[PDB]
Amino acid sequence: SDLTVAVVLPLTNTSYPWSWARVGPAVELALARVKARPDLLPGWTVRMVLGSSENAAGVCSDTAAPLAAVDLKWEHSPAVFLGPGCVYSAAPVGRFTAHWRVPLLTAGAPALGIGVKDEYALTTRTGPSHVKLGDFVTALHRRLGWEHQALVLYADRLGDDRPCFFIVEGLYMRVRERLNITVNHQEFVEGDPDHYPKLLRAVRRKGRVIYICSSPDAFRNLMLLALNAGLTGEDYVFFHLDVFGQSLKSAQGLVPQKPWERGDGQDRSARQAFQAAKIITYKEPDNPEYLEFLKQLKLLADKKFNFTVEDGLKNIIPASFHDGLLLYVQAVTETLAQGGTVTDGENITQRMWNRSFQGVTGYLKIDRNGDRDTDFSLWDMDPETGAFRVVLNYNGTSQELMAVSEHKLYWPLGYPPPDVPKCGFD
Amino acid sequence: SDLTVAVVLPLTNTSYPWSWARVGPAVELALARVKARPDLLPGWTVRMVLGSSENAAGVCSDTAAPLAAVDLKWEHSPAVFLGPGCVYSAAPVGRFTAHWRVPLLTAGAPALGIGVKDEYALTTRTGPSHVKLGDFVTALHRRLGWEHQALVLYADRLGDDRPCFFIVEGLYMRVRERLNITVNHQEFVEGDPDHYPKLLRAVRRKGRVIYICSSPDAFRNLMLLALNAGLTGEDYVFFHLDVFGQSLKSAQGLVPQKPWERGDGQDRSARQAFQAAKIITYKEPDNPEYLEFLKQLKLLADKKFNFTVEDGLKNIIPASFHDGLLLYVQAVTETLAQGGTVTDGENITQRMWNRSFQGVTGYLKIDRNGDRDTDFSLWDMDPETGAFRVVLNYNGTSQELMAVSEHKLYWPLGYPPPDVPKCGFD
Amino acid sequence: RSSCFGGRIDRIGAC
Ligand SMILES: *[C@@H]1O[C@H](CO)[C@@H](O[C@@H]2O[C@H](CO)[C@@H](O[C@H]3O[C@H](CO)[C@@H](O)[C@H](O[C@H]4O[C@H](CO)[C@@H](O)[C@H](O)[C@@H]4O)[C@@H]3O)[C@H](O)[C@H]2NC(C)=O)[C@H](O)[C@H]1NC(C)=O
Ligand SMILES: *[C@@H]1O[C@H](CO)[C@@H](O[C@@H]2O[C@H](CO)[C@@H](O[C@H]3O[C@H](CO)[C@@H](O)[C@H](O[C@H]4O[C@H](CO)[C@@H](O)[C@H](O)[C@@H]4O)[C@@H]3O)[C@H](O)[C@H]2NC(C)=O)[C@H](O)[C@H]1NC(C)=O
Ligand SMILES: *[C@@H]1O[C@H](CO)[C@@H](O[C@@H]2O[C@H](CO)[C@@H](O[C@H]3O[C@H](CO)[C@@H](O)[C@H](O)[C@@H]3O)[C@H](O)[C@H]2NC(C)=O)[C@H](O)[C@H]1NC(C)=O
Ligand SMILES: *[C@@H]1O[C@H](CO)[C@@H](O[C@@H]2O[C@H](CO)[C@@H](O[C@H]3O[C@H](CO)[C@@H](O)[C@H](O)[C@@H]3O)[C@H](O)[C@H]2NC(C)=O)[C@H](O)[C@H]1NC(C)=O
Ligand SMILES: [Cl-]
Ligand SMILES: [Cl-]
């Protein structure tokens, strides 16, 4: 008569896109819609038991999270798990739920390895997957004439969830899976000046198509050093892999969008440097159901959670926890309707897999693997004003690059420079 | 009045050096000696509760093992854990015991990361550590004139504990920590012929001091191809990192020792090829307490465990579980003797740490970190007979290379060839 | 050093 839902998320730390202070209300909203839908779990009272994925210091822990997941299992026997969002938290809890034959839902866990559902069985990813970033890079290379060589730079703060790694892992593995071209990679550390000589050396030797996963300040500094070294959009192109748009403001207000402006007198040189630069982010949902969701989400988070939800790309994570939870109640109702129980995880999950769905994020497609398709946006500088704006869009289900508001991808040469120079890199 | 000891080891699979069918009796023996020592835990009745580190398929699991560790904690609240030996099993359980403030004892878990006792607190390694292999390679390079460049080749069967990786991780990290010389590495797969061209190419390009971590058959085939390609002990030296002496028989009988002989008519060419080859193994304990232990161990395992313990280097693992368990009861008795309880894990562990001890394996030293010092043996071919024999011995506590039975390390050139060739590697 | 891609998800068996 009641469905127990176990959550393993950062309950106290709010810095995470899947923090409970942000996902919690997004879940409250989804539970509220289920009670008002007579067609969704009729007469059921869906309960929720929570667990902090975070350790003592408040970061999400490869130890706290699985320990949490066990107390929820042996105390409540939940039917499904929600979260974790952290890769290193999710991986252990995933092996536990896959063993327990319990479905696991999360908008986080974007790494390449979570894709292996032979290990992470009953783990359905309703958020972005980094393999999906490979898909967009593949489309972007096929539709731009780069079929030889590309260069990747990524940095990580030690002891975090290693986000730029798994982003480059999912991009490297899926792009060489589909194109078999040369993809050079180099890790670095942002706070270490010793690496910047190494990076600029590698830029002009290991490729012209260059992808960087770093903080906004690091990607900016690199652009200034690139400009200083005489590297321009005629021979190079710099893709900032900034998926949550940290180098940008929200799509709601704060018009226009300038990431190169920093207020240190270097901005004048920064604008010119960013002429060779483009930003790859996620796709802000167009549907007005998203915008209502945000409104209900912000109110519900201030009121019940004493947290203020600012606008931005991060908000598709709670939005996708909302939709993913609706996706499950649908399937459980469907499973009860054909004589099955809420514990038929395999039946329940297979309903959710290979299935389009209409949620606050609009059209979302759970692929054959159990991973939501990811839609990406490409940002470019309008050479007139210097501000950035979306010029391309990648439908992830269809893998189509569609131009945005009739905008043209600015190129200093009139066309993309070639991924290989003239008489070799020498 | 009773001390509960939780074991997380392969309880059904016996293929592991730390299999329960081999460690179980070795532990019975240690429990028997404690009951007969009035000076060790007087009046205490030390119980044991067991857990299978292995999953369904019988291999030790990064899931079954931590799941096992939790059920034992919530059912018995043990004072100490024993095992696991598998790296991917030990890591998760170690983070759980380190969180639970419970000591952890194992002869296995040799990887470089387990060394980090800030994370794996109260984890005392009484068996070999791979960082310790770096120590021997360091001593061996200092006392042989190689201070520039060396080459490492390692293979792993997919889905195992990745033993040759962590062996090379512990050797790479500790040798570059201490010498800062060029150490090139390359992974390969034994069953893939496509790699052997790559290996022979890299052999003559990436160094002359060459270490190989592979099966005996793989290392043999490599030597045959090296001989075929005209690579001899005049310019090269091949160290088989065969720690458990899989390419050798037991030190008890089966005289003499021929790894190159295979009974396929190629043995004639193999013998000559192995003139450029040396084997790095662990050190068989000299003390006659070991030999009595083996005797009692074999008897006890046939009787109570319906298992036959063959002779070989693997047996220092159960031996070190035996000794390590004695080391703990000593320290707990010591802790009880100065007003402390069996739960004073920090006091208990610090007694065990930085401490020499005399057990069935003879002299064993728990370093400042909590890792038993590891003694190594170096094997070489007597060019006269062709058989292999120990010519060097590395005391791990003293880091001293001592010659064995006045034997001379065979060199085709009368002295070791230089780690760098004449006019470069070109 | 090396770029370990696809080699499990654990701060022990990765680089
Ligand atoms: C990214 O690409 C995706 C892949 O094509 C798009 O998904 C498609 O979404 C559309 C609608 O958004 C969907 O169309 C039809 O889907 C129903 C199932 O087949 C079908 O029954 C619908 O038809 C009904 O409704 C229309 C009015 O809407 C009536 O005129 C009809 O008579 C009928 O009653 C509907 O036409 C596609 O099927 C679906 N494609 C796939 C392959 O699933 C995404 O929308 C796209 N998103 C963006 C932002 O580009
Ligand atoms: C590898 O190197 C290790 C580093 O030295 C060796 O450890 C050493 O082991 C010896 C004994 O095996 C040990 O010697 C003395 O240790 C006691 C503590 O200091 C000391 O009290 C002993 O002295 C007593 O006993 C002798 C008779 O044995 C009497 O004559 C004395 O009067 C006294 O009553 C003993 O002499 C070293 O201290 C110890 N070194 C360190 C640094 O701890 C390993 O043995 C060696 N292993 C191999 C196989 O080579
Ligand atoms: C909420 O989560 C934040 C990010 O996950 C976290 O910020 C980060 O905090 C860690 C430590 O908590 C810092 O890392 C430091 O880690 C070790 C251990 O102390 C140090 O030895 C290192 O030198 C390193 O400085 C990160 O630098 C830090 N990063 C950022 C951007 O803040 C918050 O602390 C968490 N806050 C709460 C209240 O839980
Ligand atoms: C006892 O442990 C042995 C070693 O840990 C184990 O041997 C190995 O078994 C695994 C599978 O159990 C084999 O690996 C195979 O793994 C996957 C899953 O089936 C396959 O898709 C692969 O292709 C691969 O063949 C190893 O090859 C095998 N290795 C050896 C040397 O035997 C035993 O099976 C365990 N036995 C029991 C009774 O527990
Ligand atoms: Cl998390
Ligand atoms: Cl184990």
Q: How many domains does chain A divide into? A: 2
User: Does A379 share its domain with A354?
Assistant: no
Kind and range of the H or E run holding B9: strand B4-9
Q: Which of C3, C9, C11 sits opposite A113 (nearest CB)?
A: C9
User: Does B247 share its domain with B149?
Assistant: yes
**In this complex, is the C-beta atom of B92 within 8 Å of any C-beta atom belonging to chain A?**
yes
| Calpha distance B196→A412 (Å, rounded) | 47
Neighbours of A350 (CB within 10 A): 15
In the structure encoding, which two tokens stand for residue B166, read together? Answer: 């962590």
Atom of ligand 2 nearest to the CA of B402: 50
Q: Which residue of C has its CA nearest to B110?
A: C12
How much distance in Å is there from the Cα of A323 to the middle of ligand 1? 18
| CB < 8 Å to B74, chain A | 74
Handedness of CA B121, B124, B128, B134 (dihedral sign): positive
Give the residue carrying structure tokens 């997957």. A129
User: Does B410 share its domain with B296?
Assistant: no
Atom of ligand 4 nearest to the CA of B13: 39
CB A24 within 8 A of CB A85: no
Give the residue carrying structure tokens 């307490």. B289
List own/partner pairs for A12-16 with CB under 8 A and 24 or more apart: A12/A52, A12/A54, A12/A58, A13/A54, A13/A58, A13/A59, A13/A60, A14/A307, A16/A60, A16/A85, A16/A86
| Calpha distance B258→A30 (Å, rounded) | 70
In the structure encoding, which two tokens stand for residue A149, read together? Answer: 């060589």
**In this complex, is the C-beta atom of B101 within 8 Å of any C-beta atom belonging to chain A?**
no
User: Does B252 share its domain with B394?
Assistant: yes
How much distance in Å is there from the Cα of A101 to the middle of ligand 5? 21
In the structure encoding, which two tokens stand for residue B161, read together? Answer: 């504990």
Kind and range of the H or E run holding B52: strand B47-52
CB B5 within 8 A of CB B82: yes
What resolution in angstroms, rounded to 1 decimal? 3.2
DSSP per-residue codes, A360-422: TTEEEEE-TTSBB---EEEEEE-TTT--EEEEEEEETTTTEEEESTT-----TTSSPPPSS-S
Return the closest-CA partner of residue B128 out of B315, B256, B309.
B315
User: Does A182 share its domain with A222?
Assistant: yes
Interface of A with C in 70-99 (CB under 8 A): 87-88, 91
Neighbours of A320 (CB within 10 A): 28
Coil/strand/helix, residue A152 = strand
Of A363, A365, A374, A392, which is best to mutate to test ligand 1, by the most ligand atoms within 8 angstroms of its C-beta? A363
Cis peptide before A128 (omega within 30 of 0): no
| CB < 8 Å to A66, chain B | 66, 92
CB B322 within 8 A of CB B293: yes
Give the residue carrying structure tokens 């012929």. B193
Residue A72 CA: distances (Å) to CA of A6, A58, A273, B145, B415: 6, 19, 52, 59, 65
- CB contacts < 8 A, A to C, total 22
DSSP per-residue codes, B192-208: -TTHHHHHHHHHTTS-S
User: Does B112 share its domain with B213?
Assistant: no
CB B388 within 8 A of CB B279: yes
| Calpha distance B192→A303 (Å, rounded) | 61
CB A16 within 8 A of CB A85: yes
| CB < 8 Å to A122, chain B | none
In the structure encoding, which two tokens stand for residue A370, read together? Answer: 């159990």
For B211, the domain range is: 128-284+373-426
Among B52, B54, B63, B74, the residue to mutate for chain A (most A Cβ within 10 A) = B63
How much distance in Å is there from the Cα of A281 to the middle of ligand 1? 25
Q: Is B164 annotated as a binding residue?
A: no
CA atoms within 13 A on the CB side of A419: 19
User: If you count them, how many residues does chain C have?
Assistant: 15
| Calpha distance A399→A171 (Å, rounded) | 15
Q: Tell me the nearest-neighbour CA distance from B98 into chain A, angstroms.
A: 10
Coil/strand/helix, residue B168 = helix
User: Does A279 share its domain with A289?
Assistant: no
DSSP at A122: T
- CB contacts < 8 A, B to C, total 22
Return the closest-CA partner of residue B79 out of B309, B307, B266, B329.
B329
Q: Is B89 annotated as a binding residue?
A: no
For every residue of B287-319, which 3-state class applies, written as one string? Answer: CHHHHHHHHHHHHHHHHHHCCCCCCCHHHHHHH
The residue among B354, B372, B390 that closes a domain is B372
Task: Say whether B162 and C13 touch across the interface (CB within 8 A).
Answer: yes
Burial (CB < 10 A; 0-12, 13-18, 19+), residue B365, is middle
The radius of gyration of chain A's CA atoms, rounded to the nearest angstrom, is: 22
Return the closest-CA partner of residue B239 out of B315, B284, B175.
B175
CA atoms within 13 A on the CB side of A79: 20
Coil/strand/helix, residue B27 = helix
| CB < 8 Å to A169, chain C | 5-6
| Calpha distance B379→B313 (Å, rounded) | 14
In the structure encoding, which two tokens stand for residue B392, read together? Answer: 């060097």
In the structure encoding, which two tokens stand for residue B201, read together? Answer: 């190419």
Coil/strand/helix, residue A214 = coil
| Calpha distance B212→A107 (Å, rounded) | 43
| Calpha distance B326→B7 (Å, rounded) | 15
| Calpha distance A16→A89 (Å, rounded) | 13
CA torsion A24-A25-A27-A28 (nearest 10°) is 120
User: Does B404 share its domain with B344?
Assistant: no
| Calpha distance B320→B183 (Å, rounded) | 31
DSSP at B284: P
Residue nearest to atom 2 of ligand 3 (CA): A59
The residue among A357, A372, A387 that closes a domain is A372
Which of the other chains make 3 or more beta carbon contacts under 8 angstroms with chain B?
A, C
Task: Say whether C3 and A187 touch across the interface (CB within 8 A).
Answer: yes
User: Does A164 share its domain with A277?
Assistant: yes
**Ligand 1 residue neighbourhood (C-beta within 6 Å):** A 356, 363, 395, 397-398
User: Does B103 share its domain with B40?
Assistant: yes
| Calpha distance A274→A268 (Å, rounded) | 11
**In this complex, is the C-beta atom of B5 within 8 Å of any C-beta atom belonging to chain C?**
no
Give the residue carrying structure tokens 């002989």. B261
**In this complex, is the C-beta atom of B44 within 8 Å of any C-beta atom belonging to chain A?**
no
Describe the strand order of the beta sheet including A149-155 as a list of residue ranges. A182-188, A149-155, A209-213, A237-241, A277-282, A376-381, A388-395, A400-403
Q: Is A1 annotated as a binding residue?
A: no
Q: Which residue of C has its CA nearest to B182?
A: C1
User: Does B259 share its domain with B294?
Assistant: no
| Calpha distance A318→A289 (Å, rounded) | 14
User: Does B218 share its domain with B361?
Assistant: no
Coil/strand/helix, residue B212 = strand
Return the closest-CA partner of residue B387 out of B247, B260, B263, B262.
B260
The residue among B372, B396, B412 that closes a domain is B372
Return the closest-CA partner of residue B154 out of B106, B186, B194.
B186
Coil/strand/helix, residue B369 = coil
In the structure encoding, which two tokens stand for residue B30, read together? Answer: 């240690």
- Give, in degrees to the nearest 5, the angle at Cα A199 between A198 and A204: 105
